[PDB]
Symmetry: D3
């Protein structure tokens, strides 16, 4: 292996320069399966990597795991191997009433509620997505007619308090985050996720291109019993979109 | 007057919902002159406002003056009058060797080296531009074949120390900003300006659309002796681009 | 021109070392008119400069425009031209019940709710006024028997949220400033303005003397329909005071 | 499943109240294998969970994945299931010359270079380990005669810049972390890891007991070429020590 | 004198390497009186120093006065004289209902609500106690059967607002500390004191060992008329404990 | 006693409303001795209090001890007893070449390098002295012809690192303070002391008047070997000046 965690060699990528990075290792195969000649390259810790072919060009799919820390490792090591474009496809919880479960959200920039982004640039630096990737993702979503929303995303190092959830063990939320969701809502923030802040910041400040898209599997403002079928259908929609976006970025 | 500083009334705008906001009062007439039926509406403090017609639609041009403070007043009061889209057109100093004087820069997001943006959202919130406005500005630039660069901009509350200039009275730069330009350069920041951080943040967090474009009148990394001719020629192309962008946002 | 923005040359000042710096360009002539041989030197952007004579000594009057950013430019460039003493005369909104519209407030130091001051010294540095200037302003006010208050001023980069105004477009105030006015009131802060923090900090940390005086045109704690005549009368009072203070600083 | 990510139910734990939480999913089975009746309960994302019996008491082993984010999810959900004591066992890079590869380090408290801990308590709160767990870990290490060091650990949201590594793609380290390792060294910090800050803080501030132990697989101050043999042998001893510590905490 | 404030010479300590540091000068003699051959060495400002013998070894007792500032001076100068181990014995106000007046609290680490600790290490560094000292203090308390609590302590630079007391002259508490006590309580913090944050941080980051123990003289959650006799009895208990702990650290 | 630490009752002050607060308990008697009918009221911890008569009016002299913490206790409790004006008289180390040992420094405002001031107002609030007290101190100094300097003072919670001293046990200074003295010097800061930031801030934000004066006993920029004679002679003149200032504040 040429890198410390991914268990991959430069040769494994066969010259690939673009990688699709889902948060869940389980989603990696599903994404690769949409492309040609999918092959599993490795699996270590939360990092599962597959290689596939898109329009004759080798493409990488590598899970980041949950959070900026593992994400920073995956991006850095993939970059060490030649990857220059990263497209994240994940799941998210919307916080706006007009956004529905099943909708696809494209992040223009993220509210930095993470710690890793700070290891690449001070807080004042914007966790903004690459313009070409965002455009490709937007066009891709439009190509299949998906209900899409484009805007700001709150990226939290936490699934519970940072996203102001009280249905927890302690049932408390530290002062800094009390009433934080309502604030983000008033500011027009579309959703909560846990890797975009780190991904976009580290890429934007290091000459790497990054895009971010996620399917809504829950809406914090509208109570409704989760539909597993709907979730699977949503993830499928987003996956088709991230792959189609990758085609435009080759 | 219906607002505290601009000396304007709701009717003066005749239903206008988009405003072009240059930093210099002197540039307002030049911008309006490119459109139809240009009329001067008011002039108070650093706020000079003209109204014009673009493709049959009333449009506003209002100077913000230098800095987020005066900018925040202009944006807020214009918003109080119905304006929902703001396109800033200004001048800027590039800090990348590959960017030349005369080039046009479109800001995707800004490094917040200002204080006003904090009066609308905490530092972690991204000073990101609206996707539609950015796109319009990019297309507009392409329409006339202008050499264009799209990326991050460092927006400073200061023209001198915040932009790490030492050719000053004290000849010193506070510790926080010592070696700051080199850092931004390494992070791929394209330029320094003084209003985008405030403009983009306050708009992005209040449901208002904002775009940002500026012409390069100097390159901090290139010796070169300033030329008024090309400097005014650069302002010209930028003005045309912001107007053409506005057409696509009507 | 020897400076980048003011459009002034060293020779224009005829050796002047003191400048009166109002926020509004329109007030510059009114101030100069009180002195001898008033002459307009230049007018660019929000920077309008006049020269006059006080007790046989050349004196400068230069508008800073609204906000620390434009203020920092004006002060720096005037300093580049030889100015060593700066006296700001502005308008302000009082936040104490015992202070009345028409009263004159002399700032001893300011609460730094700006961003520019940070470009000269870290937040812990006090935005304190020069002792000689403050004294001169206090004596000057007493010379004409004006009702005067001496104390701390909250200097905001914003006219609306930073001064906790809710009568706005969004009708919201970012968390950091929610309930901030009541806090300042409890701390004895006299008023809100938008340039003293930047002015005092940059001067105090660079060997330049600065004083700050403003006339009350509104009291946030006492509702009362604004009287234009009263405002004009107040500005006149403050202007006479800043000029008289300048005489004692020659 | 009774929790959102772990894919576990309350009954799966059979009343277990203590969990051993390694960072790597692969290490979970190795840890459980040292105890009685080891059974795999689930595997989802980076969360692999096994149940085993220690001195007749049910015990849980659950991987956290790399980073405070995934760690915060695992701890919270395990707590939702009844777990009240958490013992982390991991790998680490020493930064002190007197510490050797193979040595075992017990963390008394951690330098918070993470973002998740802030989602539970402000920075001033100490990321301190529970006294009983620390004691148990120390005794456990002594029981097998392992060379042990007790002290402070720097817990980073990043494997590269936060640990001031320059052998990277960008080859640069953000200003905040430039010369940071030397500073920690001078302060007596023993090592760098990536989960203790989050683990200790969230536990200490929510009435949960937490301990932290790790085996040294590299020493940043000593040249030496990595050895898989001793690296796996080190993991072995650490695993035994954390299990033995758990026995004393039942 | 070999130091600037303590008025002590290296020779005065007769090779002592451990010092007991109470906050009150008046308590110094009481502590020394429990040991052999107690002798007063000096008294300057709030620094009163006595020397005594414990199991044949010379030991120092030196008051720090109230607060991290005076504490930092005492520790530094004593260290300059050879002291390497510091055990603080003080008084404290408990904030947990289950803790009673008369109980003894051993601090594992402290919430840094002080300013001095920052002069030795950034806020992210833990104000953790030395493991050996904490252990000795715990054992010592157990040796005489004192009701003991081990945990986190909130160390404030202030006796009133920082400990959220409203029974004051202003009757107000700055925003940062409003509702702060309830937050600490929810986080399991045991008590409020005013020197541990500074003591533990400066020692932990400079290779010096420090322990912290205090007797409860009030419980903020349980109203009860103070008993002077009880207080004297409590201080006596804690003193006997700190001395006994010192014996185990020789 | 009517207060928790000072061991004083309301009646002890006989209606006094002004207090002189030196840092050293030993200096209290010296100050009182200059006035009429001096009487010792109490002595507890570092708080020594005397009462005296100045021009027929009862005046209080109370030591604060070293540091904002003990200072905040003394000021608060004295305020609880009726004191409304506080004049600090201390010793200080100058950092400007033009200031000589023996000179007297009057503080207009202080750089807040303390933690206690934050317990009364956020960092942006200025630690400014009352205008009347400052004036009185300045006039008082002039009345006896003392070489006086008026300006900003750096008030540190620490005598060593915060004042960037390297002649210490560790011989190191935390990053935050490395090169800090040179920075303050360039900003025109006159000296280093340890109580003004806390004193001025808590007074200015609570409607209490405060003044600050200190005698130079060392100049960090000038070699010179310390002299007890001139050091005590300097304390003498400063004490007289603070007393004379008090007369003008009655
Ligand atoms: O489904 P992924 O891609 O993991 O993305 C979302 O899912 C996780 C939270 O359940 C976090 O990673 C969040 O960003
Ligand atoms: O030319 P404008 O539009 O003013 O923009 C630039 O010019 C000014 C500095 O000279 C600042 O306003 C900066 O943002
Ligand atoms: O009237 P000037 O001098 O501009 O001062 C006040 O007026 C403006 C706000 O209306 C800000 O500049 C504020 O400081
Ligand atoms: O081996 P684990 O337990 O994962 O611990 C260490 O290993 C990872 C870095 O390689 C991070 O998780 C770090 O904390
Ligand atoms: O009794 P000491 O040891 O002084 O400790 C406590 O007592 C003082 C407050 O009354 C502060 O020093 C606090 O830490
Ligand atoms: O001599 P005092 O009044 O104590 O003032 C100075 O002396 C002490 C330092 O030696 C600190 O209190 C400092 O402020
Ligand atoms: O609510 C949610 C759902 C998925 N992922 C998140 O980060 N948050
Ligand atoms: O260098 C420059 C030029 C124009 N505008 C800026 O803000 N900076
Ligand atoms: O309320 C007011 C009035 C004038 N100027 C300000 O800054 N605020
Ligand atoms: O150097 C290292 C090795 C293991 N784990 C870390 O966090 N850092
Ligand atoms: O309540 C209290 C009592 C003693 N010491 C403190 O710091 N606080
Ligand atoms: O150098 C010095 C001397 C006296 N007091 C201080 O705070 N510093
Ligand atoms: K302006
Ligand atoms: K992970
Ligand atoms: K003290």
């Amino acid at each position: 292996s040429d890198v410390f965690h991914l268990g991959l060699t430069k040769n494994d990528l066969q010259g690939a320069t673009l990688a699709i990075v889902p948060g869940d290792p389980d989603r990696v195969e599903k994404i690769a399966a949409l492309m040609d000649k999918p092959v599993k390259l490795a699996s270590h810790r939360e990092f599962t990597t597959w290689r596939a072919e898109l329009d004759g060009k080798p493409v990488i799919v590598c899970s980041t795991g949950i959070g900026g820390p593992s994400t920073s490792i995956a991006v850095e090591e993939l970059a060490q191997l030649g990857i220059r474009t990263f497209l994240r496809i994940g799941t998210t919880g919307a916080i706006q009433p007009h956004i529905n479960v099943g909708d696809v959200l494209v992040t223009t920039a993220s509210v930095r509620l993470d710690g890793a982004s700070l290891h690449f640039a001070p807080l004042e630096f914007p966790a903004v997505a690459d313009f070409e990737c965002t455009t490709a993702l937007v066009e891709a979503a439009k190509s299949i007619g998906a209900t899409t929303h484009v805007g700001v995303t709150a990226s939290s190092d936490t699934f519970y308090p940072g996203q102001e959830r009280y249905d927890t063990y302690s049932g408390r939320v530290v002062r800094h985050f009390k009433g934080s969701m309502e604030e983000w809502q008033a500011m027009g923030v579309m959703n909560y996720e846990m890797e975009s802040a780190t991904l976009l910041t580290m890429c934007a400040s290091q000459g790497l291109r990054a895009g971010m898209v996620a399917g809504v599997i829950v809406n914090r403002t509208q109570q409704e019993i989760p539909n597993a079928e709907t979730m699977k259908q949503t993830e499928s929609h987003a996956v088709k979109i991230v792959v189609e976006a990758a085609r435009r970025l080759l």
